[PDB]
């Protein structure tokens, strides 16, 4: 069972996807047979299909290029954390640390070593694309992001065989840049042509929305993910509910209790931010709302698909 | 004894120091009186001489008020290395982990949870008069290399006790990152009031030249450091003739000969490459070329200081 959250009054089903969907999923299928970074064919087509399906509700305005080009950099890092992170790979934390610190050295610019894992080459030319597409600053803010990212997930790695070494506030913090909102929003930004001043950003209004956008991406997803997080061998994952359970005590069921009353509330938050934003201002603040609405409805839709439940 | 490298072809001395070293050392006392960093009084004087002395030789340019936010901002580097990072700080990797992390938290923006740790919340005041002082670019450039040298330490700390697991190459391609290089001339454009474009950071005479600039940097404070790293507790520290005397077996003393060959060939190469991009074409070129002239005397400069070779 597990008590879940329900969205009908914020973000209602069904979920518009774009046009592009199946052939997102084959050109994927292919650009992975050219650069295998899936050990099994079984996780590639499940990870291909979520990834492409997903993108066309994320970004149903698209272009099928532009839509295959984040289709690409967001599976690129999702297999990146499913090969690497969160101790699935051995060699623990420095593990990790030594991959992601190729990757640094790929958003640096100016060649490093080579490396025989292939993730840190499909980077390279993962931003490449982006850079020639992107503003100077869109693009700086896109692998700012990255970074960010990194960082983040070599903190989870500490923190994966302890999990209750963690305080909330900290893990509140930390796991948008583990869920990797802030890239595919600066990906957004890219990809459907606009870009906010510095003090557009700065307006409450559009951080308050922003927060809310990425709290419910990084709940929503450790909601979906106990179970199959949870059957692995070790025990509870680093998440929302598991640390909920320790700060509280009670039951699971409590937690989740507690975890789909603040994923509603959040919910809540971002649909009068939503609402605000568009009520027209500068045309960036729309459309940034608008942005940011179909990347919410895209992470509702992605907790049904069988990456998470199964059946 | 141990060979050292000769520059007097390449970079003589003397090394001009701008005018406002004396007033600077006096500010820097009294911000950290406010901001205590530093725990002993006695590290406090010999950081604040260093960094305000080799800050008048990195901008002889200056402007007592910029060279202070400059010094400020390598102070907070340096302290914050000293104290947490290189196995200085007890706790492991994990620790220095979790103290990159809030400071990541800084850089991404948008309020994190208040740190115990003092270092987070300077940084915050440093990176906002930095960006009020710098074009958007200047700044994210500036907020990137910190992050590229917060993932570096990081890497550091999980390689010190065993620095002959690190292949040459890639401590080559990482010391610049721990050797703070990049943070310095990307303040060193904002204070100085220039920016290339990104056409001309492809430049190969431009890349040239940063590269054996950041090289050398790294390479002489190695060399410098190495009595002072290697009088603590633990073995040989990593770093460069750590790494070459375990390449090629033999003794220490034919390591740091071949460490000090490296060293005057690299300071050869930017010589030469500070003379094509001085030899006009855009100012930004030039000045480029000179910004990173004084950046690397001073990096010879510090050499002698009291930090690394005492009396
Ligand atoms: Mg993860
Ligand atoms: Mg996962
Ligand atoms: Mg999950
Ligand atoms: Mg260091
Ligand atoms: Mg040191
Ligand atoms: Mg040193």
């Known amino acids: 069972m597990l008590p879940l959250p329900d969205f ?36 590639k087509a499940v990870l291909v299909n979520i990834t492409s399906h997903g993108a066309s509700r994320t970004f149903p305005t698209a272009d099928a290029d532009d839509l295959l080009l984040f289709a690409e950099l967001l599976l690129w890092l999702t297999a990146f954390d499913d090969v690497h992170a969160e101790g699935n790979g051995v060699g623990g934390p420095a593990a990790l640390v030594d991959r992601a610190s190729e990757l640094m050295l790929v958003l640096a610019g100016g060649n490093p070593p080579r490396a025989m894992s292939p993730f840190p080459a499909v980077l390279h030319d993962l931003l490449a694309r982006f850079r020639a597409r992107a503003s100077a600053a869109a693009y700086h803010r896109l ?63 559009v951080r308050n929305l922003e927060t809310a956008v990425a709290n419910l991406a990084g709940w929503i997803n450790d909601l979906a993910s106990y179970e199959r997080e949870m059957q692995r061998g070790r025990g509870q994952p680093l998440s929302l509910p598991t640390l909920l359970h320790a700060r509280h005590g009670g ?39 608008r942005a940011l609405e179909d990347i919410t409805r895209s992470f509702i839709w992605h907790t049904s698909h069988a990456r998470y439940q199964g059946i």
């Open 8 to 43: 009908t009054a914020t973000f209602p089903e069904p979920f518009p996807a774009g046009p592009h969907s199946e052939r997102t999923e084959h050109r994927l299928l292919d650009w992975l047979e050219e650069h295998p970074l899936l050990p099994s064919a079984k996780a």
């Open 143 to 205: 692998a700012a992001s990255l970074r960010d990212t990194l960082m983040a997930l070599v903190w989870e790695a500490h923190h994966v065989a302890k999990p209750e070494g963690v305080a909330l506030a900290t893990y509140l913090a930390m796991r948008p840049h583990t869920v990797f909102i802030k890239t595919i929003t600066a990906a957004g930004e890219i990809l459907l042509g606009y870009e906010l001043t510095d003090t557009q950003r700065a307006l409450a209004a």
């Open 251 to 289: 039951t699971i069921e409590e937690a989740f209790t507690r975890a789909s009353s603040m994923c509603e509330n959040e919910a809540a938050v971002a649909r009068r931010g939503i609402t605000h934003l568009a009520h027209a201002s500068p045309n960036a603040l729309t459309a940034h709302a």
